[PDB]
Amino acid sequence: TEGRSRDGGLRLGEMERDCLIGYGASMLLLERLMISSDAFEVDVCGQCGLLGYSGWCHYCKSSCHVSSLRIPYACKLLFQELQSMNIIPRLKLSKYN
Amino acid sequence: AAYTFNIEAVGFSKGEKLPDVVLKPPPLFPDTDYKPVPLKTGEGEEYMLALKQELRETMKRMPYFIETPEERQDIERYSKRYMKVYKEEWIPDWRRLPREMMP
Amino acid sequence: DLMTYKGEVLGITRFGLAKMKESVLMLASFEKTADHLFDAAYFGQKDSVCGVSECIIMGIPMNIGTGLFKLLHKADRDPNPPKRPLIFDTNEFHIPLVT
Amino acid sequence: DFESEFVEVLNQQCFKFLQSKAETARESKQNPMIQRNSSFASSHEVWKYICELGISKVELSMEDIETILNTLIYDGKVEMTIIAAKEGTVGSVDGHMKLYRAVNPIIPPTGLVRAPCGLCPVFDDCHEGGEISPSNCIYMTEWLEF
Amino acid sequence: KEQFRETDVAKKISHICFGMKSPEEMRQQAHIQVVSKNLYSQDNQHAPLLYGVLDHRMGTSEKDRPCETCGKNLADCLGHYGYIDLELPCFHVGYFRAVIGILQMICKTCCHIMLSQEEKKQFLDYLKRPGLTYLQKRGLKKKISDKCRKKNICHHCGAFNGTVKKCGLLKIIHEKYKTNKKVVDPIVSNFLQSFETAIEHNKEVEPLLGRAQENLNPLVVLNLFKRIPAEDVPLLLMNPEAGKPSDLILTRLLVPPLCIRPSVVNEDDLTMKLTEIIFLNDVIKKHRISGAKTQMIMEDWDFLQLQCALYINSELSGIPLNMAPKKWTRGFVQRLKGKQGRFRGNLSGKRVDFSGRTVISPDPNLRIDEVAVPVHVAKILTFPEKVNKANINFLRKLVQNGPEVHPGANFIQQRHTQMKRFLKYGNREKMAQELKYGDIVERHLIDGDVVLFNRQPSLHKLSIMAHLARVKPHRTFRFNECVCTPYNADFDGDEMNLHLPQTEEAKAEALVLMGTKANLVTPRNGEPLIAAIQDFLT
Amino acid sequence: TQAEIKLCSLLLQEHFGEIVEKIGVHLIRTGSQPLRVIAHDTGTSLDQVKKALCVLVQHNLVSYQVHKRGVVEYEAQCSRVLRMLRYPRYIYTTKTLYSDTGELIVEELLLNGKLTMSAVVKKVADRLTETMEDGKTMDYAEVSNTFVRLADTHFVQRCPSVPTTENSDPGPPPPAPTLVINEKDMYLVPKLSLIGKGKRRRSSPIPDDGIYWQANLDRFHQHFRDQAIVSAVANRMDQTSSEIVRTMLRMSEITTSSSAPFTQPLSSNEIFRSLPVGYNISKQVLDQYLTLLADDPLEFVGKSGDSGGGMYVINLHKALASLATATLESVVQERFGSRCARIFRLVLQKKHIEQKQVEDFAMIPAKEAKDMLYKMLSENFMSLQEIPKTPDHAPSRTFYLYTVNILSAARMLLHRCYKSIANLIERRQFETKENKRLLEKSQRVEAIIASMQATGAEEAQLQEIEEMITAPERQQLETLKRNVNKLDASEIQVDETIFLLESYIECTMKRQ
Amino acid sequence: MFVLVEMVDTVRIPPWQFERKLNDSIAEELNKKLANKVVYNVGLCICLFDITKLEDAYVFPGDGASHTKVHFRCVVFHPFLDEILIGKIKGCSPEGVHVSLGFFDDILIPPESLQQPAKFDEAEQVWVWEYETEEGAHDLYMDTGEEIRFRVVDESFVDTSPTGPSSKEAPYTLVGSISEPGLGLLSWW
RNA sequence: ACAGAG
DNA sequence: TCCAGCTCCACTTAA
DNA sequence: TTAAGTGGAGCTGGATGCTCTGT
Numbered sequence A: 001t002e003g004r005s006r007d008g009g010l011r012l013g014e015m016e017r018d019c020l021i022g023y024g025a026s027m028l029l030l031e032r033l034m035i036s037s038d039a040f041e042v043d044v045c046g047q048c049g050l051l052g053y054s055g056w057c058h059y060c061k062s063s064c065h066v067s068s069l070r071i072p073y074a075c076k077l078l079f080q081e082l083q084s085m086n087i088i089p090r091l092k093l094s095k096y097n
Numbered sequence B: 001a002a003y004t005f006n007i008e009a010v011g012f013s014k015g016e017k018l019p020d021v022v023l024k025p026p027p028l029f030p031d032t033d034y035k036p037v038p039l040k041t042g043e044g045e046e047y048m049l050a051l052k053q054e055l056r057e058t059m060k061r062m063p064y065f066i067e068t069p070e071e072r073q074d075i076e077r078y079s080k081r082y083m084k085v086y087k088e089e090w091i092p093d094w095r096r097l098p099r100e101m102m103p
Numbered sequence C: 001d002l003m004t005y006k007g008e009v010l011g012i013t014r015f016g017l018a019k020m021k022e023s024v025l026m027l028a029s030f031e032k033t034a035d036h037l038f039d040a041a042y043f044g045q046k047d048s049v050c051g052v053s054e055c056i057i058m059g060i061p062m063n064i065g066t067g068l069f070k071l072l073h074k075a076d077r078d079p080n081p082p083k084r085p086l087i088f089d090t091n092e093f094h095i096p097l098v099t
Numbered sequence D: 001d002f003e004s005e006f007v008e009v010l011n012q013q014c015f016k017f018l019q020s021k022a023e024t025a026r027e028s029k030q031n032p033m034i035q036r037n038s039s040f041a042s043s044h045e046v047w048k049y050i051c052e053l054g055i056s057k058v059e060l061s062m063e064d065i066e067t068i069l070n071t072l073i074y075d076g077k078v079e080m081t082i083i084a085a086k087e088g089t090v091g092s093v094d095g096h097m098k099l100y101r102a103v104n105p106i107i108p109p110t111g112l113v114r115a116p117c118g119l120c121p122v123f124d125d126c127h128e129g130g131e132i133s134p135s136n137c138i139y140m141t142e143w144l145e146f
Numbered sequence E: 001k002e003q004f005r006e007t008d009v010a011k012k013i014s015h016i017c018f019g020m021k022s023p024e025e026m027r028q029q030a031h032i033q034v035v036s037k038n039l040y041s042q043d044n045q046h047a048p049l050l051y052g053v054l055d056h057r058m059g060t061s062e063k064d065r066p067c068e069t070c071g072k073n074l075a076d077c078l079g080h081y082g083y084i085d086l087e088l089p090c091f092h093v094g095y096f097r098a099v100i101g102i103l104q105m106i107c108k109t110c111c112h113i114m115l116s117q118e119e120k121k122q123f124l125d126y127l128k129r130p131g132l133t134y135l136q137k138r139g140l141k142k143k144i145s146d147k148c149r150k151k152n153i154c155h156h157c158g159a160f161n162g163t164v165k166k167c168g169l170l171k172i173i174h175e176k177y178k179t180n181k182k183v184v185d186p187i188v189s190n191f192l193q194s195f196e197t198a199i200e201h202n203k204e205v206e207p208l209l210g211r212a213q214e215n216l217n218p219l220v221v222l223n224l225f226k227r228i229p230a231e232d233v234p235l236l237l238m239n240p241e242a243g244k245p246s247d248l249i250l251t252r253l254l255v256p257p258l259c260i261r262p263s264v265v266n267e268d269d270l271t272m273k274l275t276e277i278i279f280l281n282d283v284i285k286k287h288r289i290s291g292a293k294t295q296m297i298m299e300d301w302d303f304l305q306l307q308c309a310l311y312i313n314s315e316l317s318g319i320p321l322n323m324a325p326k327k328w329t330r331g332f333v334q335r336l337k338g339k340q341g342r343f344r345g346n347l348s349g350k351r352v353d354f355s356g357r358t359v360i361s362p363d364p365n366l367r368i369d370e371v372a373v374p375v376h377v378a379k380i381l382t383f384p385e386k387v388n389k390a391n392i393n394f395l396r397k398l399v400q401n402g403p404e405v406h407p408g409a410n411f412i413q414q415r416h417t418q419m420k421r422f423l424k425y426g427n428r429e430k431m432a433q434e435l436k437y438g439d440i441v442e443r444h445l446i447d448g449d450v451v452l453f454n455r456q457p458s459l460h461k462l463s464i465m466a467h468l469a470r471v472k473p474h475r476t477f478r479f480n481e482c483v484c485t486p487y488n489a490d491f492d493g494d495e496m497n498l499h500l501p502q503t504e505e506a507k508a509e510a511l512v513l514m515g516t517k518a519n520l521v522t523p524r525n526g527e528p529l530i531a532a533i534q535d536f537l538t
Numbered sequence F: 001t002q003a004e005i006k007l008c009s010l011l012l013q014e015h016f017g018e019i020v021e022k023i024g025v026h027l028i029r030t031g032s033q034p035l036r037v038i039a040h041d042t043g044t045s046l047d048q049v050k051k052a053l054c055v056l057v058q059h060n061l062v063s064y065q066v067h068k069r070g071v072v073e074y075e076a077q078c079s080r081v082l083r084m085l086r087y088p089r090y091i092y093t094t095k096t097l098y099s100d101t102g103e104l105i106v107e108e109l110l111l112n113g114k115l116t117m118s119a120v121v122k123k124v125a126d127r128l129t130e131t132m133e134d135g136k137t138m139d140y141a142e143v144s145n146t147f148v149r150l151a152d153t154h155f156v157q158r159c160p161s162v163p164t165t166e167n168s169d170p171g172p173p174p175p176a177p178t179l180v181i182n183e184k185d186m187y188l189v190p191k192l193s194l195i196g197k198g199k200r201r202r203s204s205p206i207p208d209d210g211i212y213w214q215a216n217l218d219r220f221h222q223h224f225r226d227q228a229i230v231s232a233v234a235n236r237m238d239q240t241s242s243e244i245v246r247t248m249l250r251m252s253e254i255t256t257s258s259s260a261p262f263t264q265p266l267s268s269n270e271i272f273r274s275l276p277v278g279y280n281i282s283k284q285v286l287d288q289y290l291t292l293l294a295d296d297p298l299e300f301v302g303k304s305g306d307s308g309g310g311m312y313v314i315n316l317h318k319a320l321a322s323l324a325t326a327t328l329e330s331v332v333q334e335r336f337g338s339r340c341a342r343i344f345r346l347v348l349q350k351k352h353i354e355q356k357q358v359e360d361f362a363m364i365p366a367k368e369a370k371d372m373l374y375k376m377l378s379e380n381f382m383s384l385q386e387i388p389k390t391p392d393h394a395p396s397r398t399f400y401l402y403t404v405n406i407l408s409a410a411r412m413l414l415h416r417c418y419k420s421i422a423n424l425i426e427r428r429q430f431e432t433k434e435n436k437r438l439l440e441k442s443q444r445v446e447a448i449i450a451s452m453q454a455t456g457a458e459e460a461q462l463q464e465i466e467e468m469i470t471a472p473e474r475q476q477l478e479t480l481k482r483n484v485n486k487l488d489a490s491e492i493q494v495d496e497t498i499f500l501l502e503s504y505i506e507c508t509m510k511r512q
Numbered sequence G: 001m002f003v004l005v006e007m008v009d010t011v012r013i014p015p016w017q018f019e020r021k022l023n024d025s026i027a028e029e030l031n032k033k034l035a036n037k038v039v040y041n042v043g044l045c046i047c048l049f050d051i052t053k054l055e056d057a058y059v060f061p062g063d064g065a066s067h068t069k070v071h072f073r074c075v076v077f078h079p080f081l082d083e084i085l086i087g088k089i090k091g092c093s094p095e096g097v098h099v100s101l102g103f104f105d106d107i108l109i110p111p112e113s114l115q116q117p118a119k120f121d122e123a124e125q126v127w128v129w130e131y132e133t134e135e136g137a138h139d140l141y142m143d144t145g146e147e148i149r150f151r152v153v154d155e156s157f158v159d160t161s162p163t164g165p166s167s168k169e170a171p172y173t174l175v176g177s178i179s180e181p182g183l184g185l186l187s188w189w
Numbered sequence H: 001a002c003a004g005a006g
Numbered sequence I: 001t002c003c004a005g006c007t008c009c010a011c012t013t014a015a
Numbered sequence J: 001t002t003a004a005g006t007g008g009a010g011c012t013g014g015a016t017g018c019t020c021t022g023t
């Protein structure tokens, strides 16, 4: 939330982001701007590249290609605002190796 | 409640008879008043019907119907020679065909 | 050298950055955020998630800095270890039956 | 409209007169050029006949039937050819006279209408894997039964 | 007995491929069809309707009422789509400028692309080269469309192909019948005299017939784009696996899940736009039956295009006065774009927890790498210490002290469990005995924690540095005045921010890279910034 | 052409199978390609690509050409894939003009794609043995005698020839021989002295080598074009008048282009000798018909001359525009009803018209006409002109003149046809695949009767066939056959609609 | 009668196990995921046979465990068609005779492939066989189930995967025959 | 939406 | 409040 | 004489700092 009245918390702006890049601090930038804000998991079907739910893909009517991806929630939100605009972000996922 | 647009620009100058609210979605196959024309029959239009079915049964047997190759057979056995699918092979005329296509 | 490596003097404007940077999500996170996203839909463009800005958007660690290298654990391991010999299915006893 | 439940019976009654008159020339079979002339009706005689049948108390004025017969052209059932009023019992137009004859359609109904697809109202929605598919269509499952 | 299944398929994103859905793929994603205009039932039970918007088959946005599709709460649910059928096609306002481009390249009569066999052979081999980049595609689209616009007759059918251009807000016109002072061309001369029935009854046709042209519209351009040959689609620079020309005209529309547009803003502007689209779809459908004039149907269609376009982008320039919104509303574009939009406001930078703010005041008895943190902040800002052989006996004493004494702990969490026991209740001397290796104790901030420290305007990297915390009673943050020059701080009621990194890897990157002792010199000219200041120089 | 490519995928799978429809569809969809990337874009192994390309070139479904640096590029001929659907109509129409020997010639040419003249006369003789009994062989003479009659009538034509390497460019072998068509010898047959007999399947060096022959599909379309014109005249005027048209078109055959607005004129003086002797008509009455046809506003015939007595030409393009319109009006009538078909013919004759004139002229009231008008927009049968008063184009200040455009509505209606046939095939294949259980079961019981039919076959096996539980099941197999026979027959009959619409679209294009 | 299957996997070794040789810890963590489970197209995995190759042990960010791609071979009970096996009857049932093969219990002898003399049990669970000279139709497949010899004519895999969103049928099936001479109870031949 | 603070 | 692309229209060369 | 390639002028759409602290 936004501030002191609402026990809101503090903002890591676009300028503080530019500072941390210049230190090469890749994991701290991941901790601050993902883990301690909006960490989430989505089911992604590797066949159609769309998001699914509960390990089920309604588009394919199958259960075998679905996988879990660690994603910021604001990006999941973006990936559902864009589909309603009919801009489809079809993902492709490799293994983490 | 009023909307963003003015309803008077669309129509409805009297102030009533707005269209109703659809409760259940319409069915997937709605009923139609008109029906297809029945087919043409005859001694000639039925001979084309029988020739059409004889071209499927022939061209699947002709050597142009290249079937997909089998694979990952598990073990070898003596019932391989008794169950070998035998079929003769057609050969093209390699003058017309390009040099890049010899097997 | 960044302004001149493509042979033309490119500005640090949105127009120069669109000639330098390939990534849709980098371009869409600066200016003209609608137009770049509809163009990527039309062109069917695929976006490399390699760039810094889209790594922070997608929540993956950036390549620059501490992300440029990988760490291996120095476990006490023997790669290509001694194999168990087969006894039965070895080639010298199983010459093919058919001619 | 004049009356929709009124024109619908006059529409068939006029065509039956032209079909009758065309049938007379086809039964006559004397000389094909003369037979073609005999296949035409007068624009005034068809009006004088329909008003004489006595369907209604209101008079079937000639200025209406002259435009009612156009509906038989747009149904594709009759031709119209204007001829000069060289001779005629009235000559209803200055220098001109109108002839009408019933005609058959150019070709039988096509092949597309015979198939169920030709008439479908949800044709844009039908796809192989979808909710609406040829493999689960009700229009085909009905029409193949009878 | 049981079949093998992989336990936890974690994967890594390799690329995002953008594209567009066909109208019959939308129907395959969406769980329901939406047909009802009313948001809520009229009766006092305050339920939403079964087949309107706010239906809980499309998810939930309140803990009170669960989602219907998967039976799960707000916290567990990803959301699900519905669709609206549109009775007439409409231009998508984001794709509109691309719709015109294709119609400038294709022949309007047979839908083949207007290029010779040689130019088609040339560009198709340009599009073969490996590693074609996004800039090269945009340049190639220009050169392709350039040639198509300089031709006026099709090589394939022969029909004339005049200019295609915009003619007002979401309208397209084709100059098929240009006229000139020269000898009149055959095909235009036939068209100009075909109006014989109209001229007999309408006098005003006879001036205006010189301006008669082909008014392209969604019912026509959807029928053209179905007929474009798939061989010619790559030369429009459309990728034929991400979309088709047919998909650019929307005859169906997805409605977002409820968590995209939460129930108390009451309803969001997207939900009220979708009501208006559904209402106008009922208006147009009825007027077709009840025999409205063509002037009314066309006007209603113009409204349906506007309401869809303002649903996507509510800032359109060319809106006529008798159609302009009285109130401003968030379209999808307005919540993406700008400083308070997704990309700047919620994606590139975002509000973070384990953070604090207070007035700063001097303390020269601290070292330059230290910062004084007040006890009131230290009792709140906790760090998750993982229990292991080196700290088990230390964390036990912290668990015993509990939340109210400063070297203490607020939460305890068991090894393979994700709920947290709030340590204010229960008997802490029992919970200390039942510590196992692999438990997490959320201890208070203590002396020697690596803590980030930052003034609000940052012009260089030294504006955020890492300091070793030391806990002290008074409320302000305190640091040695030698570090005032990097932060540009001046102790006149200034405030500074503090961040507590919640991860061992984030401590090390903060300590080694961002420590004050590692940052005595500015990157710019290599000059020292942490040095003596007034009353240390005098 | 997504409807075309979907339909081409099914046809290649039914006649050639899976690993060749992959290559066929890929060529139709992408255009011309070198060989190496056909494999790579598909993931097929290189040997299977060669097998797939060599069968598609045998049946004349792909062309090839040499390009820069000597690479061969193949190119699919999309329309020629769709003409595999009309094959039973070709085999029937040759049985109408010619005997059963001429039927079997065209069957072998269409199924093998190309044959040498020696090979066809052999295989027709072999297959006609089953049609006859009691010692009488088929002999190769009465086969060739029909083939040389087929050749003169242009139903059969020679393929493009290999060039003479010794005369032209002797030396290093080219990547592909760059075939060319010779206009002299397309209809000049080799002379064959060898004769023989067809073998009756007992089961217990070549002079015309390289002279390949194939069916001339364009000659069949000139036949089917005539039948559409002749039958239209048979309805409107008379059977006698239809024969006069059939007489003009049969003479026109050899001396006119298959695509031209007008054929060669003929005088009525030379029509008279060409008409069959049984038509008891005088020369003077023959001139009565020709003027009454030329008076018709449908204008199937015109004058176009005055020398040698009365001169008359038959209009090829203008007959097709009539037939395409009659096809277009007939689908309006069945889909929306006669009162809507009234409005379609009204707007088509009153070329631009407004709502108040439609209700006035058709005697159809409001709220019934307008509902019909607005549907015809949404199915693309009818268009709006929209003449503006102002450069606003605002709906309140413009007159919405309706229009029917025949060419766009013919292209639109043709697109409905290609998807319609694809749906009919998809229904048949679905019901055939989902009954493979019963079809194998009904085969195996009949296999007990077919296998060991006569040798050692005791009578004690004829009752054990109905003893299986398939006897109640049989009701389904009668439902299967009645479904398939209606789906197959509709797949033939929609081709009658395609040929009428496509021939109109084919003639309006100049392809300059 | 078994087969080897060559498989690859990425094994997570957690950091408390760093005191142990990696080839020992990998094999234990692979047996825990494969033993007594059916892998769909290949059969029932008994145990790991050996590790044939072992790639680099990466440490990925945000974790301390080591992930290493392992190449290994596993002994899997996949029997080829028309093979002879010996095993004990667990049960008699109206649908046929159910045979056990140690670990494996889903072996079906269908009545369409049983011995022809007796084919429909007279309201009895136990299956019967009638020979004119010896045993008047009382000969039976005893509930104690003395070993039968059977020939595996058919096998089938059923994909036992979730249908629909989440919040027991036999996945590997084997079909025998006993009609040939020399097949049956061991005491009969 | 306005005022503040640095 | 300031600034790049896109399109319309006169203005010479060239056949 | 005019087909066409390129100059110059007007229209259009984009952008304009970082946070807390209150009503």
Ligand code: SF4
Pocket: D116, D117, D118, D120, D122, D123, D126, D132, D133, D134, D137, D138, D139, D140, F423
């Ligand atoms: S719904 Fe069925 S019958 Fe109708 S067009 Fe589609 S496939 Fe044909």
Ligand SMILES: [Zn+2]
Pocket: A045, A046, A047, A048, A049, A050, A057, A059, A060, A065
């Ligand atoms: Zn999927």
Ligand SMILES: [Zn+2]
Pocket: E058, E059, E060, E067, E068, E069, E070, E071, E072, E077, E078, E079, E080
């Ligand atoms: Zn849900």
Ligand SMILES: [Zn+2]
Pocket: E107, E108, E109, E110, E111, E112, E154, E155, E156, E157, E158, E159
């Ligand atoms: Zn064209």
